[model samples]
Target: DPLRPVVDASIQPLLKEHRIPGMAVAVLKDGKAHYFNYGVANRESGASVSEQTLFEIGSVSKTLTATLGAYAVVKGAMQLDDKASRHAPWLKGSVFDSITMGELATYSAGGLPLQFPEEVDSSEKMRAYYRQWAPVYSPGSHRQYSNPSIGLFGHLAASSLKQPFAQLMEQTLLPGLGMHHTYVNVPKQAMASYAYGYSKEDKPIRVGMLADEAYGIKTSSADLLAFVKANIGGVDDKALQQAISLTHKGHYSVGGMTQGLGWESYAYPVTEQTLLAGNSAKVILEANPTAAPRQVLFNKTGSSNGFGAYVAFVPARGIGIVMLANRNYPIPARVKAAHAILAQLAG
Candidate 1:
């Protein structure tokens, strides 16, 4: 039931003060999913936010892809430390020739840019982008979150699994995890569950399933909590557990935090001083476009032309929070506030 009315009451007012159009929140506790929705999903259509509404999860897609890669590795289909070229073999320059799959998953594969050339718009063209693009830095030298690099990483992972990435996501990973509603390309039967994505300015954007490895995904809060549950070892699926382990395994050390396979780096506090500090919040704000901070929290943010989302969880505390927005917003402060409330509730 409603365990924290005080925390629940504070959400809508905060959204109104911030002028956010629509938002969905899910709290994970005691092995159950609690969901909350506020504002209009589409202001023009007058659609209200609901538990079934789907939101595009942006770079959060990378985490999913990374987990799948790890799962494949766990099955001996690939190796995280093996050179990516062993799988894809098309990297022309020496940049990614020796880059390991582990390096790519952590955004540390030799300082690739955040975007690929416009030619990467199609699968055929994406193949060409890989063949033509040269790495600008040494492998594992720096951290740059590049879509092309991650997308290529996904492509390689799929190749290793002997299936297209989306097919692998739908046919193997998600189903194995019992997350039927979460998908890179939503199926026809569940199309109605998808909430139309809106821009920060409240306009609908129609890019559908075009950015599969990067931004293209539609999922409900409840379904996403199922995903989080699977990742945290609360689910019965063997493959899902393997997938989560790969994502959460600390692989590299960034500036302030340790990087995992697909998950972002995080630090843990030693006492109440560290516990009370909003280090996670501060790191998220300052780390964008600059060197990401090593902080004492786990965090990830997602944004699309039409949607924005954020997920933050303290696994040690057994607390997780998810924020979904129909209209794309810049940061995830509202979700962060929800975490603080849950932290208190857990205490």
Candidate 2:
């Protein structure tokens, strides 16, 4: 209860300074849930935001896609070190032939672009794009934050499972995680809870199509915190637990950051400077594993043009935080807020 007022006071100034119309936050600590909601879900309609309000959670979806890939691994459908070309034969004889699924998941497969060319929309075009594509470095050589690389990783996971990625996420993973209200495509029934995202100019905007596995999840704070809690060992399901644990394994380092499946990890008692550096574009790619033996802090930041979201947890501390805003706030703001609150919880 003491932390509620502190969190509210911290969030108020941020909302004002960032011009965010509405925001929702959920924190899980000591096996308890704390929630804070503010502002309007739709400015014109005057509907207030709540626990059920949904926001497009951009690249944060990558973490879930990584879990799906891990699920495929658990099911014996694929191996992390398997060449991607094995699952999608269309990728054979291309640069991807040498790239393992693990490298793709960690963005270490050469230097794939952060995104595909706009002309590469259809599956055929996507295949064509990969066939003609080249990597700047050899496979497993460096880290690059890329949508296309992880997108292909998810595509391969789905191919090996013989299920569509969207269907697997919507019908299986979400339900398994008890995320009843989450979706890749907002269903008609959940439309009422969908929040409108505001542009920098104050105009309302919707998320454009990108790779579904990369940046295409719409989720609520309540649901995402549930997922976060699971990542911190709050779930009872064995398979889900295995999959979540697999994602936390550090494959390599990206500057001050350690790259996991989709989440990034920091050695604990992590500093604000380290988090800021890790989230920046100037990250140095290295093949070293995480140096920390225990007490790692895991996190991911996401954004559409209009909305921004962040999720973080320290499994050793048994604490986690989720923040969703209708305006595209900076990553530092999210990290700073979460860090402050997490420090309080840790203390």
Candidate 3:
């Protein structure tokens, strides 16, 4: 109950404005964990949100995929500079030959779309889409946030390791990070814990599996916060720790955010204007040229058909947060709410 006043002040407004059915927040301050749950996971059952309630994390899944790629690099299974076609033979001779694995993971692979083209929905179509694809800008030149961009990165990453993406993530990386409730494909037995997202009109909905690597993870507050804890202090596994470290390295600066493997970071004591501009649609929907990480606020925002989420941590301040909700609210709202809460806590 110690965190109630701050939690209620910031989160209640968000739930009201967005009509969010439920939310679960986990905070790590000075390495201590705190949980605050609100609303309901399901309207039919009226199940109140709990620490165990799982919600789709959308593109935030890309961070885990990025870590998988980084993990492959650390293990020598793949190189960040390796051509994409090296692992997926089908991409040979295509533009992918010139696009580095790191470019794909960082969303700078020559003007990729934010989402896969509707026509290219299936795996077979996706493969063909890449084979015939061309880039408007050179790789690593302009950052265009894209699902297929990082989805293919995850595929090639798993290919280099000679394993499936889900298998590598759920079986290898998750276990190494001490995460038990995160899943690419939420297993059957765990279905009850998974929350149903409420659409804008209040209809029940669920996330898709199309770009599973890019934007398909359902996790709980406790588990997702474990990932934050790892970012704050890291885990015991040296290789996994190295991969986590690699993801935080600043590769490209698009506006105020420094683009990394899966996460984007901004310098600490970040102003609201800079943070909002970085998270704005201009950054998300269009390509922005690379400009330029230290004393950072590492973070990512994710949304599915029915969910909205944001996670951020400042290593210097020793504070991190995971905010998961069942309604797909606006990104700015999530950002502001998190910023307010973090400002209070950090101060």
Candidate 4:
């Protein structure tokens, strides 16, 4: 049965209601890529959204950063349980000294805030912030999604690997995975394909370089699905396979959600209620023991000032999706739409 029309019916109204300028969706089924596009990539020029149109994926980049960290672990550069200070000696004697790479990867490092304070700008400023920073609770106490937490996790991974985080990701990981169209910073040639995101006020805006590792990836739906497929073991590279597998292994649980390296997973076959509950902000502080689910659904949601994205896949089912929009659409809408499609695909 054709699913494109069903997907169209679900998303078309959301785009109009939310005033989203452009959006793209990609679905992976039985190891093949299928695409659907909507609206304009550039409102002024009226360019139609396409598979090659790049949108800033925001915190979804965290999953890629986590993959790099896992690669570092697989390469013997660092252990997951190693103290943060071990990789970055500057953290010694600071509150972060007690934090481990694994905890940071999972956002379980003692109540780190969602974003760094406004004053922290440069790398040295971040160092100073950490030196004075104190955990609200004991490390590994609960999950508090924060840019600084993963920023430091990625920084330490780069430190251990002796390469700049952006360089390592752009020069190595993206190429290895055949995600040639993706970028930490969009190149001159690809600028023509870059989509401009519109803010709530209808002003066009671009994602700033606040925490590059935490939320800096600019990618197309096509490239993202390729990356997701690799995570699903569609590739033959042994080292890349090991790194992708490591990212999905659950490390901690908060309520019904299990936090993997950078992705949140729920036991499948997951219901709409389970997905809404897990994505709710109310569950951020709920610390519950991990429960083993027979099958798991891996996912991540991301946003910048003017863009929104949601990605998910069930490895067991060999199915996955990438939803990208120029406007930062509501999470509930994204979750609901994705679950609807996934439920249909699973059935």
Best-fitting candidate, scored by lDDT: 3
In model 1, the runs with Cα more than 4 Å from the true position are: 92-94, 208-210, 269-297, 332-335
lDDT of 3: 0.88
Between candidates 1 and 2, which one is better according to TM-score?
2
Residue 310 CA displacement from its true place in model 2, Å: 0.5
Give the backbone clash total of model 3. Answer: 0
Q: For candidate 1, report its TM-score.
A: 0.86
Q: Per-residue lDDT for 335 in model 1?
A: 47
- Kindly give the number of clashing pairs for every candidate: 4, 0, 0, 0
> Which of 3 and 4 is ahead in TM-score?
3
**Lowest summed lDDT over 10 consecutive residues: which window, candidate 2?**
284-293
lDDT of 1 at 205: 73
RMSD of each: 3.8, 2.2, 1.2, 1.9
Superior by TM-score: candidate 1 or candidate 3: 3
lDDT (CA) for every model shown? 0.68, 0.86, 0.88, 0.86
Candidate 1 lDDT over residue span 179-295, tens digit each: 678888777887666777765566677452236776666777777777777665455766667668667766655445556765664565423333323334443332222343342
Candidate 2 similarity to native, TM-score: 0.95
Task: Put the candidates in TM-score order, highest first.
Answer: 3, 4, 2, 1
Model 4 over residues 1-347: C-alpha lDDT tens digits?
38798788788888988988888999988888889999989988899999999999988999999999999998999999999999987889987777899988887788777888887877788788888887777777677887888988998999899999889999988888879998988999999899998899999899722467899999999999999899775567777789888988887676677888988999888888888888886764444333342277999999898999999999999888999999998888999999988887788
lDDT at position 101, candidate 1? 78
Better-scoring candidate (lDDT), 1 or 2: 2
Q: What TM-score does candidate 3 reach?
A: 0.98
